[PDB]
From a paper:
On these grounds, we identified the same enzyme, EUGO from Rhodococcus jostii RHA1, as a promising candidate biocatalyst for the efficient and selective dehydrogenation of dihydrosinapyl alcohol into sinapyl alcohol. This VAO-type enzyme is easy to produce using Escherichia coli, and its crystal structure has been determined. To achieve this, a variant of eugenol oxidase was engineered for the oxidation of dihydrosinapyl alcohol into sinapyl alcohol with good conversion and chemoselectivity. To understand the effects of the introduced mutations in the EUGO8X and EUGO10X, their crystal structures were solved at 2.3 and 1.6 Å resolution, respectively.
In that campaign, mutations D151E and Q425S were found to be critical for controlling the selectivity and rate of dehydrogenation, respectively. We therefore incorporated these two mutations into EUGO8X, generating a new biocatalyst referred to as EUGO10X. When purified and assayed, the EUGO10X biocatalyst generated sinapyl alcohol from dihydrosinapyl alcohol with only a trace amount of side products and with complete conversion over 24 h. The 10-fold mutant was found to have a melting temperature of 76 °C, only slightly below that of the thermostable EUGO5X template (80 °C). The D151E and Q425S mutations were introduced in the heart of the active site of EUGO8X, resulting in the EUGO10X mutant featuring enhanced chemoselectivity for dehydrogenation. The high-quality electron density map of EUGO10X complexed with dihydrosinapyl alcohol clearly defines the binding pose of the substrate in the active site. By superposing the substrate-bound structures of EUGO8X and EUGO10X, a subtle ∼20° rotation of the plane of the aromatic ring and concomitant shift in the position of the propanol side chain of dihydrosinapyl alcohol can be observed. This is permitted by the smaller side chain of Q425S. Improved substrate binding is also allowed by the mutations, via a hydrogen-bonding network of the substrate and the side chains of D151E and R278. Inspection of the crystal structure further reveals that E151 may be better positioned than D151 to promote the deprotonation of the reactive quinone methide intermediate, leading to the formation of the dehydrogenated product. Furthermore, E151 may selectively decrease the accessibility of the side chain of the para-quinone methide intermediate to water, due to the bulkiness of its side chain, causing the drastic reduction of the rate of formation of hydroxylated side-products.
Author numbering:
A (entry chain B), B (entry chain A): 2 to 526
């Protein structure tokens, strides 16, 4: 059957598709099953079909976005705006609401509008990937560096708009986002901050402007379609050194985190975003599961010791990067060695001390942590046939016992559902993103359903323990927002009220972050 | 005559006042003219009466705030929430809309709810002043320090809610704000961030929570009455050093700013928030105008030279503070001396090198920049009889030509309207707050009217040159929001839609930031 927007007939949708073609050109509207396969979730969750797009519209300009939104309002067509649509682990480009039209802004709105060397910023359209911006900075001999997530094929804008993160001192992308332009849900266009002052040169200099500060309301949001976004860019330091600390025992996690916090909270000596990855995460980056265990069910401890011995890695592997003059780097590395060396069996390696396969992750972090984008971690998806992943990322206090509690709770459910537990604590100043990647055979419908049921269990169990997730997959958005229900669901009620005011026809990404416009509430999707 | 809410009769207002007394206690409702005199703007702007409160209500609890908001909805009573109501320069405690009832949350909601040494944060009620928090930290021998504005008698919460700023590395108060509790305009209570997840310990560790990020919409805002707010607290460094650089000429401003930017953008060597204050600003802190000049009109060049000579200060005076191990401080100070020394006439002083009257401001900055609150700057108001100030604060790029353009533009109008121009550039990473404090005799109605007309001209003239203000006085809020009118007033229309959705009866601080609810729009008050 043809995927159609809810309540929209074949005739009405054909008519809307043609109005879209009038705006963007016939080449830039996709609506056949073969064309749309590329836009389904690449890592499907659940046995049954879900998150089916009805079309893809690729606008060239803000003016075209406004016209697309107005047409969607006339026809009642839901729109899922994306930048590059590489939100893999959280749905890809696929809409939360099946039948929605994807607005792929980044296909043609892909210009670097400004890179300012003096004030250190960029003004970007959504199609600028991290690779694109890196190539620009390299080609202009820029003194600036970008901040990228693990995979460079995503969007500087799009990643920020889901509050994604990277690993340099500028790792909080939303923090350094400065100014945006957005098409509101009925087609009006708005600039935030100093961009609201005509002729201001400070759109990318001063984020707040005047009055209530709105930009965060357009992140993890369905309140508009972003068409331009500014971001601050850090100056590249004169030198850097990355390092790996291997820790032998599962149980070391508690002491690692507790030693880490005093070294991190003042952004020195731990200047970048430390990451603490387990052996499964690192092994998946350089090898397939069957090299260590080709049997049924969870991997046995003998197979784990082999992974560690052969890759020369610990169960927990701490990656960091230091920046600045060589003397500062040496002083900070000495402090780090002296602190973590109090853990029995810890071993230290700089990026120049490992040329072996187990050191491939360290080399990859040394790129990433220096704003050099990479795709090396895509090899994690070769762990099993037809590999995909889902991201389960609860927030943790930077406390070793809390980390251990979360590790044990996730590992337990992981084992129960026969999914390997790849873990990476991504460490901020006062919080940790406990990244749980579950890699699975996306062609196997029982594996897909196990992933869905396992993660719904984990969302509930984590919440009963006081833990919430910072970001989540289409399939989990209602469940995750349901956990943030202090005061009889006060937060969601507030969001719904704003959603219905700005989007009275219920057009933009219905269900994003569990926020449904009035016409869709009380339904089973 | 008695001050009444718009459209509310004496009999209705009396009934509402008694309902307020039911909630908070009859002792905690003020409504006579003598009682309300203290809640008038202490630095009145304009000759005519403006911004008159009809009553003051002091709630003891969030539950009482909810009840007050419910009563106000029933009766159509506008409410102006304040914490400590010390917003001097911007209206004091006085409401934008005359006839509003001030809700002074800080009078009785004044508890430090938590200070966490390990993770470095505080959870505060609105009545905690900077002095209160400092005394707590001292009393408990805390390793943490606060970040305060120039005057310590304001509210850690209230200052943040107007996006006020201080001068340590944590000087962006809203940035370090983490979690809040707010009573929405119809009386519902909501927690943001991880506080929306019942049982989370991360309310003050991770600001975003899940879904659209709303906390900024409650700053410079009329979308609620905030009852609790968290804020991160920096660890106190092992050592510090403050310094003053004096520069001889008005025209040095261009070179000072251009030398400063490379030293600031990486947060080192200029680690704190530098301030660049002109001789009028520093002279007012230690002396009266008639010490230097008792004639008519703007101060002549020779009197300006006498201020410089006796106080041993420049026309421009640069104040900074360095932090960290003693060798790091000495290396950074050497970098700062080498850079700024290229300006002919520059002279350098650390806080150890001046014990004269001219050095009083340096010693005060050494307290403020180390989280030690002060009221010394209140002496600026003794510059002339019955002294008050208004804050005209355009944002400037950190560019010397732009700073000079703004200086010359403001000086030109200050001279025209016979107001001394006290200037302080408060310097962020990529932007400066160009603080123009105009000090005037508040008893002189012509001076008050000159201040109003001069600043209205400056708002328009600055906007014509592409500059907007970050914060403003009641009397200028409509004019300032009117300058942020890109896209035919798109930003204000967006704020108005949200305002009417959350506040359908138009109760909370109508006209704050130029944002009026439907029932008042177009009424010219
Ligand atoms: C192995 C692996 C490792 C990963 N590591 C990381 C990591 O380190 N850090 C990280 O952050 N992520 C990580 N991810 C997740 C994902 O790869 C990235 O976050 C990716 O950059 C997001 O996709 P994107 O940039 O194309 O954004 P998009 O998919 O274009 O956008 C993401 C979402 O933002 C919203 N949005 C986007 N554009 C607009 C717009 N114009 N208007 C309105 N709303 C919009 C929509 O809700 C959209 O679904 C990882 C994934 C995998 C599989
Ligand atoms: C000489 C001088 C120097 C100054 N220097 C500085 C400086 O360095 N930095 C600086 O930031 N300011 C400065 N100011 C301005 C002012 O002194 C401070 O900002 C002061 O801290 C603000 O008053 P307050 O803290 O009592 O906040 P309040 O007056 O309580 O609140 C300010 C506003 O925030 C909102 N608000 C407050 N509480 C609530 C609540 N509970 N719910 C909802 N909304 C609320 C209201 O709009 C209120 O009007 C200066 C003023 C002068 C005269
Ligand atoms: C920090 O946020 C994320 C980190 C990773 C991988 C971290 C590997 O060390 C994946 C994500 O989504 C799939 C995230 O959101
Ligand atoms: C940085 O923000 C402000 C600074 C000052 C005075 C700075 C003196 O050096 C006053 C203000 O309001 C009256 C401000 O908002």
């Amino acid at each position: 059957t043809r995927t159609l927007p809810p309540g929209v007939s074949d005739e009405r949708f054909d008519a809307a598709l043609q109005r879209f073609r009038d705006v963007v050109g016939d080449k830039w509207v996709l609506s056949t099953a073969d064309e749309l396969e590329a836009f389904r979730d690449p890592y499907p969750v659940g046995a049954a079909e879900a998150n089916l797009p009805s079309a893809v519209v690729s606008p060239e300009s803000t003016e075209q976005v406004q016209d697309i939104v107005r047409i969607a309002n006339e026809y009642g067509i839901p729109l899922h705006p994306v930048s590059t649509g590489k939100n893999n682990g959280y749905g890809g480009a696929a809409p939360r609401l099946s039948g929605s039209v994807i607005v792929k802004t980044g296909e043609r709105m892909n210009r670097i509008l400004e890179v300012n060397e003096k004030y250190g910023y960029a003004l970007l359209e959504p199609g600028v990937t991290y690779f694109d911006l890196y190539e620009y900075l390299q080609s202009h001999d820029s003194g600036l560096m970008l901040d990228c997530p693990e995979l460079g094929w995503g969007s500087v804008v799009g990643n920020t708009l889901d509050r994604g993160v990277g690993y340099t001192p500028y790792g909080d992308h939303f923090m350094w986002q400065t100014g945006l332009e957005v098409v509101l849900p009925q087609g009006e266009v708005m600039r935030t901050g100093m961009g609201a002052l005509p002729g201001s040169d400070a759109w990318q200099l001063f984020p707040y402007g005047f009055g209530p500060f709105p930009d965060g309301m357009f992140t993890q949001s369905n309140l508009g379609i972003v068409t331009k976004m500014g971001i601050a860019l850090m100056q590249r330091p004169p030198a850097s050194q990355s390092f790996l600390i291997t820790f032998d025992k599962e149980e070391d996690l508690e002491q690692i985190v507790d030693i880490m916090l005093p070294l991190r909270i003042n952004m020195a000596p731990l200047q970048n975003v430390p990451v603490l990855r387990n052996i499964f995460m690192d092994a998946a980056a350089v090898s397939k599961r069957t090299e260590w265990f080709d049997g049924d069910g969870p991997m046995p401890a003998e197979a784990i010791e082999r992974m560690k011995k052969d890759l020369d890695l610990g169960f927990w592997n701490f990656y960091g990067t230091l920046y600045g003059p060589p003397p500062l780097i040496e002083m900070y590395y000495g402090m780090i060695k002296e602190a973590f060396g109090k853990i029995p069996g810890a071993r230290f390696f700089t990026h120049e001390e490992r040329d072996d396969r187990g050191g491939h992750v360290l080399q990859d972090r040394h790129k990433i942590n220096n704003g050099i984008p990479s795709l090396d971690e895509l090899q994690q998806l070769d762990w099993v046939p037809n590999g995909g992943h889902i991201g389960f990322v609860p927030v943790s206090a930077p406390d070793g016992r809390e980390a251990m509690k979360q590790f044990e709770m996730v590992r337990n459910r992981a084992n129960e559902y026969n999914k390997d537990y790849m873990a990476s604590f991504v460490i901020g100043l006062r919080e940790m993103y406990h990244v749980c990647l579950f890699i699975y055979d996306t062609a196997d419908p029982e594996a897909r359903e196990e992933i869905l049921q396992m993660t719904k269990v984990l969302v509930r169990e984590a919440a009963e323990a006081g833990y919430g997730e910072y970001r989540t997959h289409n399939a989990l958005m209602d469940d995750v927002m349901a956990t943030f229900n202090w005061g009889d669901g006060a937060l969601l009620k507030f969001h719904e009220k704003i959603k219905d005011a700005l989007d009275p026809n219920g057009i933009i990404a219905p269900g994003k972050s569990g926020i449904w416009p009035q016409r869709f509430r009380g339904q089973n999707l």
